Amino acid sequence: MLVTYPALFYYDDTDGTEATYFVHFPDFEYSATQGEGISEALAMGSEWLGITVADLIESDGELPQPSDINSLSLIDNDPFKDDEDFVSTYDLDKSFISMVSVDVSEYLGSQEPIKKTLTIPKWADKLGREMGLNFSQTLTDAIADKK
Amino acid sequence: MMLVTYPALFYYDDTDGTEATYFVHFPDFEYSATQGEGISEALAMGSEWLGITVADLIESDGELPQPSDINSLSLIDNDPFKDDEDFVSTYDLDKSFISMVSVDVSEYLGSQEPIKKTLTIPKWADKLGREMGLNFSQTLTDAIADKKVQ
Amino acid sequence: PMTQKEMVKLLTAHGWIKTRGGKGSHIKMEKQGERPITILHGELNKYTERGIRKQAGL
Amino acid sequence: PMTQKEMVKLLTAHGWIKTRGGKGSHIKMEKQGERPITILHGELNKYTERGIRKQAGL
């Protein structure tokens, strides 16, 4: 399931710096991610896109129609251009516009229920129930806790 | 991963076989050509072409060209056929665009001509590598390619 | 919120709940009636931070 | 060479060999002393055919 959206890659050196490319998709309002170099910025843009679009699909929201890349400007499509409280410092020449693709198949189905057959001692069974635990949730939390 | 990115030209001509819409060319690789029906497929085929091409450069110990500055590229001036007189291009330039194409070269590295190699690594590296469920052979191969790239 | 952790903290204090379903290098914040917010790990540049704030109305 | 198969036949006549080095929807032609040529599956339009021909010095 491939989708492609144009993105703006803003070079900023002044951050001191680490990640020099701010990545924004005009079709997703205030969409923001970043990368250190060109390749990383694209890869992060793709990952952000996968997660965002997968969420829209699994929540059955509508996917925005992709903008025509030739109608985009680093100036006019600046997400912060109308924001009175923010100051952009872009180096325009080090900034570029490019397509970003992602296969959304990799981001789909992460919340899918997976049946597990477990064996626990009776003392744990009795204890968990005495505490009114949710065994499914308790195991999930425990796994997320191990990292 | 080993990620390489090169700018590509995407030329829209849907005459002569829609499904051949979007001819794809990398200016850093002379007369490079592939194609895809829509935008997504074009980028995907561009990436695939790039992966195979750069991987061969790794394996043959050739030179990897430096990626062109995407802002100095022009659909007009970098047209690969602009000069040769035989050819009549019909480009729709309003639908043509320039874009970055990324590929993980790791996926395209050849396994041909397998060589058997016995060596030693310290126990911590062995246990660490196995805990991550690594393929030790492929880890070495990838690392060698990566050294070549950098 | 110069870092992911500080940013998560900030949104959490404003009613967002960290979630699973962000993958790879990103995490996902969720709140009722809102489009979720996807946050990159590590130090964030002033633009990324600002975009994330704007998404959350902060 | 309206198609990959026709391109491959053409290049084979001119001394190129199809290897197993191909991946996905592209095949790989190799010839000693030349950089390999990578050919898309299916039908190739005037640009792609021309590009591959120019790569092969014809």
Report the C-alpha gap between C41 and C26 in whole angstroms.
6
CB–CB contact B35 D48 (8 Å)? yes
**Consecutive H or E run containing D8:** helix D4-13
Q: How far apart are CA B56 and CA B108, in angstroms?
A: 9
The 10 Å Cβ neighbour count of residue C30 is 17
Interchain CB contacts (distance < 8 Å): A and C: 81
Of B44, B98, B102, the CB nearest to A43: B102
Multiple choice CATH, D1-58, 3.30.920.30, 2.30.110.10, 3.40.50.2300, 3.30.720.110:
3.30.920.30
B148 inside domain: no
B21: phi then psi, degrees, rounded to nearest 5: -55, 150
CA dihedral B77, B79, B85, B87 (to 10 degrees): -150
Task: Give the integer Cα–Cα distance in Å for A99 and A83.
Answer: 26
The nearest alpha carbon in chain A to C23 belongs to A51
CATH number at residue B43: 3.30.160.250
Contact B101/B7 with Cβ under 8 angstroms?
A: yes
Question: Side chain identity at B90, as an amino acid letter?
Answer: T
Residue matched to tokens 């850093």: B28
Q: Please tell me the total count of domains within chain A.
A: 2
Shared domain check, A120 and A85? no
Provide the resolution (angstroms). 2.3
Residues of A in contact with B41 (CB under 8 A): 2
Residue contact D21–B52, C-beta within 8 A:
yes
Note whether A97 and A142 are same-domain residues.
Answer: no
**Domain ranges across chain C:** 1-58
DSSP element (H, E) containing B92 = strand B92-104
Interface of A with C (CB under 8 A): 10, 12, 15, 17-20, 22, 24, 29-34, 44, 47-48, 50-52, 55, 61, 79-80, 83, 86, 88, 106-107, 110-111, 144
Q: Do A4 and B94 touch (CB under 8 A)?
A: no
Selecting from D20, D38, D45 the residue whose C-beta is nearest the C-beta of B49 gives: D38
Residues 6+ apart with CB under 8 A from B140: B117
User: What is the Cα–Cα distance from A138 to B79, expressed in whole angstroms?
Assistant: 61
Residue in C27, C18, B40, C53 with CA at minimum distance from that of residue A31:
C53
Distance CA B43, CA B49 (A): 10
**What residue type is A111 in one-letter code?**
Q
- Method of determination is X-ray
What burial class does residue B101 get, using C-beta atoms within 10 Å of its C-beta: 0-12 exposed, 13-18 middle, 19+ buried?
A: buried
Whether residue A54 is found in the same domain as residue A44: yes
Interface of B with D (CB under 8 A): 11, 13, 16-17, 19-20, 23, 25, 30-35, 45, 48-49, 51-53, 56, 62, 80-81, 84, 87, 89, 107-108, 110, 112
What residues contact residue D40 under an 8 Å CB cut-off, 6+ apart? B34, B35, B45, B49, D4, D25, D26, D48
Range of the structural domain that residue B46 is part of: 3-107
Same structural domain, A133 and A74? no
**Phi, psi torsion values for C27, nearest 5 degrees:** -120, 160
Mutation target vs B (from D41, D47, D50; most B CBs, 10 A cutoff): D47
Q: Are residues A18 and A79 in the same domain?
A: yes
Chain C's closest residue to A145, CA to CA, is C20
- List C-alpha distances in Å: D5 to D18, D27, D29, D31, D41: 11, 10, 12, 17, 8
Q: What is the dihedral of CA D33, D34, D35, D39, to 10 degrees?
A: -140
> Residue A73's closest CA among A55, A53, A90?
A90
What gap in Å lies between CA A53 and CA A59, rounded to an integer?
10
Q: Chain A residue with minimal CA distance to B39?
A: A4
Q: Which of A5, A11, A38 is best to mutate for the B interface (most B CBs within 10 A)?
A: A38
Cis bond upstream, residue A17 (ω within 30): yes
Place of tokens 């809102």: C34
Classify A75 as helix, strand or coil: coil
What is the nearest CA distance from B55 to chain D, expressed in angstroms? Answer: 10
Element (H, E) at B100: strand B92-104
- Which residues 27-56 of D are in CB contact (within 8 Å) with B? 28, 35-36, 38, 40, 42-48, 50-52, 54-55
Q: Which residues of A touch B70 (CB under 8 A)?
A: 96, 98
Cβ-count burial of B103 within 10 angstroms (0-12 exposed, 13-18 middle, 19+ buried)?
buried
